[PDB]
Write an enzyme that holds these catalytic residues in place. Structure first.
Site, PDB file in Angstrom:
ATOM      1  N   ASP A  89      -7.458   2.755  -6.688  1.00  0.00           N
ATOM      2  CA  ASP A  89      -7.023   1.628  -5.850  1.00  0.00           C
ATOM      3  C   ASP A  89      -6.144   2.093  -4.674  1.00  0.00           C
ATOM      4  OD1 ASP A  89      -5.923  -0.437  -4.587  1.00  0.00           O
ATOM      5  OD2 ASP A  89      -5.364  -1.610  -6.362  1.00  0.00           O
ATOM      6  N   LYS A 104      -5.920  -3.948   3.391  1.00  0.00           N
ATOM      7  CA  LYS A 104      -4.742  -3.869   4.258  1.00  0.00           C
ATOM      8  C   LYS A 104      -4.989  -3.205   5.636  1.00  0.00           C
ATOM      9  CE  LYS A 104      -0.885  -4.210   0.649  1.00  0.00           C
ATOM     10  NZ  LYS A 104      -1.739  -4.200  -0.611  1.00  0.00           N
TER      11      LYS A 104
HETATM   12  C1  LIG Z   1      -2.350  -1.175  -4.581  1.00  0.00           C
HETATM   13  C2  LIG Z   1      -2.532  -2.621  -4.210  1.00  0.00           C
HETATM   14  N1  LIG Z   1      -3.584  -3.252  -4.729  1.00  0.00           N
HETATM   15  C3  LIG Z   1      -3.862  -4.523  -4.487  1.00  0.00           C
HETATM   16  C4  LIG Z   1      -3.062  -5.326  -3.681  1.00  0.00           C
HETATM   17  C5  LIG Z   1      -3.460  -6.763  -3.479  1.00  0.00           C
HETATM   18  O1  LIG Z   1      -3.636  -7.101  -2.114  1.00  0.00           O
HETATM   19  P1  LIG Z   1      -3.614  -8.652  -1.763  1.00  0.00           P
HETATM   20  O2  LIG Z   1      -2.239  -9.013  -2.113  1.00  0.00           O
HETATM   21  O3  LIG Z   1      -4.050  -8.807  -0.328  1.00  0.00           O
HETATM   22  O4  LIG Z   1      -4.611  -9.405  -2.643  1.00  0.00           O
HETATM   23  C6  LIG Z   1      -1.864  -4.787  -3.041  1.00  0.00           C
HETATM   24  C7  LIG Z   1      -1.005  -5.680  -2.201  1.00  0.00           C
HETATM   25  O5  LIG Z   1      -0.026  -5.212  -1.629  1.00  0.00           O
HETATM   26  C8  LIG Z   1      -1.589  -3.344  -3.330  1.00  0.00           C
HETATM   27  O6  LIG Z   1      -0.583  -2.762  -2.878  1.00  0.00           O
END
Ligand SMILES: Cc1ncc(COP(=O)(O)O)c(C=O)c1O
Ligand SMILES: Cc1ncc(COP(=O)(O)O)c(C=O)c1O
Ligand code: NA
Ligand code: NA
Lengths: 429, 428
Positions: A245, A274
């Protein structure tokens, strides 16, 4: 924006992870340019968090803007069922070329959490198709993967308060947080826990999911790359999928285009989001291998069962095509190297403050962990008064600025941090 | 666009619910205006599905454009944690005002699925704060609520293939699909299932969740508003929360601003998306009551535990504001009224076609249900050759065009549908 607009916001608009009965103050932004946010009263703030909310090229970027505007002239959106378009193809070509070789099949989506849901579904569909009874996920403690249910089920049980859903969320396997630091040495004792778990459950694990090198929301932890290498080899030997991830770590944030580069390994599944669109609007992507993508489509369902309404959104794809193009120049590598040095050098002094528990820097990420939790309202007001925008949480004051930030602006950010942790004024609550 | 691009897409780009090993052609679009899609080769097609993919004011709409570009000049995005802004405030104002009175707290999000996840989370945390052991959801068969895990947990288990995940997904309660039609009469036998289930599990049910009036992806079903009346009452009697998922029905699609208006009820939780932004880009909203929002905030956690990276996105909120302002003129009521009439009138004849099982219509949604499944690749190609874009699934050929469609464009759409079911050429 009037005061009545502000009252309306407080009484009627929820905000991220914050109380609606006891809400803390918010600041009204009317616009942004370069590395600054501009509040309603005209004050300008140097934004230190921008990259963490995906704004790695700062705000009101001309190229990003032209690209978005042009695509609006052509078409903002069109459905992706039975249709394709230039922006999605340009983007998937880039995504495929820039990531490790085996990652060549892309599933575009709307958000990071969804991107993780998708990865989690992929792994499950994969084993269903191969007739294996595998439904568990092996993860590390302190991990964070999003807020939707499946994502939540691999988030750290303590940080994410799993007692709230006890009996609702499936119970996954949680190996101990990696102890070896990125800065430091490898200690093989670290592996015992993960290993114990692997042995007891090797036959039922669908995938090892982790944030590579940096555990973000669960503690801004920075661990040793040997970990990834070991995990890849274990997954290789046991026949298990590895999901990496990189929604937070991708697109240069740790100094390499992808954090997995630190170990020279490739996951079977990669999540991205992001910075992907340069922080203009939401979008995400989950990449996997031919073996997984094909296997899934050869099983009972005849396809991978997922498909959001705005999948492949042309406006968002154009924004990202322009964001990746800025990275193509390669200027970021040095931009980050310099940000990395300036963060180490300028955060060092915090190691002398009574309220500090540890300091760590990696790429565009600088973290000052404190001994006691911060006072959200008071510390936030303080930063705004210094003309900077820094958004702490828990026992973490961290920075992740736009790669384009001028040394003069970054220096202001670091001084504000150093000043915030000198005594206990802004701590506890 | 070249053919190598097309070759790249097929080999590397997944599309919604479709095989990567046996994909069907995808048509390359380079632009769109008014109600038309413009293919790479220059062909223009009247889109008949635009509103289901959220584009109720069509494509390249001047008012939506200007708003988006203006917003881009101010700022496309900025985080929502500790910050607020005009697009977000204007939007939430409009949303509070246009929905029933008790709904006055807005959690903005990214996509429909997440909006449903938010609702479900809201319900679980609510009961948790009250100390009651309520973790199950009661829904209806043939319901569809999204593709994320929790949303999948309340989707029809047959339609979504739950066996794939049997053991992973939590097992919720599924009352039978509503039988009484929106066209027809009410039948009270319709309640027994639901009632039997409520009787047996009243004590563990956190909420009832359903799609009001129209069940979309699960069958394009149109049921009687009395059902909502009945459910709202039972939930009231039992102390159970009602979640209404209007992601597909909201913003004038069923002839009322919100399908709940058809039964004259308000839910405790309301999910919105799709047409929210006039189909320009993704955005979602979940509204709830003060009782719910506050109670959640007073429990263990001290708040509602959710918060997407792009929450409150100004660009999308601008778009949405420009889309709602168009609806403010009220012109959509007359537009959808007419579209409802033209659709009833022009699909009626399909009732006599041998390949057809049912013709139903509500607001801008017109459905022809066939007796056998369609031949995807063959029918799509047929539609494209008629200069129209119609995207069928299973045994369903439906239209849901933009509200601004001209009577002539609509007629081309209805003509194509009636022609398609005229024999078995395009079936199985
Ligand atoms: C490692 C990681 N995965 C998933 C997410 C989830 O992203 P979102 O909040 O846009 O759904 C984030 C959010 O900061 C993150 O840092
Ligand atoms: C009633 C309903 N709920 C939820 C969703 C989920 O929307 P998305 O696939 O954008 O997440 C849809 C999608 O059409 C829908 O129709
Ligand atoms: Na690749
Ligand atoms: Na309201």
């Amino acid at each position: 924006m009037t005061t009545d607009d502000l009252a309306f916001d407080q009484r009627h608009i929820l905000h991220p992870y914050t109380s609606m009965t006891s809400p803390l103050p918010v600041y009204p932004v009317v616009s942004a340019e370069g590395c600054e946010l501009i509040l309603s009263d005209g004050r300008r703030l140097v934004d230190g968090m921008s990259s963490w909310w995906a704004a790695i090229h700062g705000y009101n970027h001309p190229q990003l803007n032209a690209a978005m505007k042009s695509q609006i002239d052509a078409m903002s959106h069109v459905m992706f069922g039975g249709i394709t378009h230039a922006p999605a193809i340009e983007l998937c070509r880039k995504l495929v070329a820039m990531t490790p070789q085996p990652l060549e099949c892309v599933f575009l989506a709307d958000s990071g959490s969804v991107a993780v849901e998708v990865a989690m579904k992929m792994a499950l569909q994969y084993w269903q198709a191969k007739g294996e009874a595998r439904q568990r996920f092996l993860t590390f403690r302190n991990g964070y993967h999003g807020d939707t249910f499946g994502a939540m089920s691999v988030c750290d049980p303590d940080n994410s308060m799993h007692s709230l859903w006890k009996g609702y969320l499936p119970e996954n396997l949680f190996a101990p947080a990696p102890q070896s630091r990125m800065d430091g040495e490898w200690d093989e004792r670290d592996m015992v826990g993960f290993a114990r778990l692997m042995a007891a459950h090797r036959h039922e694990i669908a995938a090892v999911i982790i944030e590579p090198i940096v555990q973000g929301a669960g503690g801004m932890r920075m661990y040793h790359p040997e970990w990834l290498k070991r995990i890849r080899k274990i997954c290789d030997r046991e026949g298990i999928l590895l999901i990496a991830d990189e929604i937070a770590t991708g697109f240069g944030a740790t100094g390499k285009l992808f954090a997995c580069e630190h170990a020279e390994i490739a996951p079977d599944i990669l999540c991205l989001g992001k910075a992907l669109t340069g922080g203009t609007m939401t979008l995400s992507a989950t990449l996997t291998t031919r073996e997984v993508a094909e296997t899934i489509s050869n099983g009972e369902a005849g396809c991978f069962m997922h498909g959001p309404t705005f999948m492949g959104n042309p406006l968002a794809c154009a924004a990202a095509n322009a964001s990746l193009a800025i990275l193509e120049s390669g200027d970021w590598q040095q931009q980050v190297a310099d940000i990395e040095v300036q963060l180490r050098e300028q955060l060092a002094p915090a190691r002398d403050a009574e309220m500090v528990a540890d300091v760590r820097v990696l790429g565009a990420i600088g973290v000052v962990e404190t001994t006691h939790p911060v006072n959200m309202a008071a510390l936030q007001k303080f930063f705004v008064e210094q003309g900077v925008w820094i958004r702490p949480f828990g026992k973490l004051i961290y920075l992740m600025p736009p790669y384009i930030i001028l040394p003069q602006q970054l220096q202001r950010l670091t001084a504000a941090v150093n000043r915030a942790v000198q005594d206990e004024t802004f701590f506890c609550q």
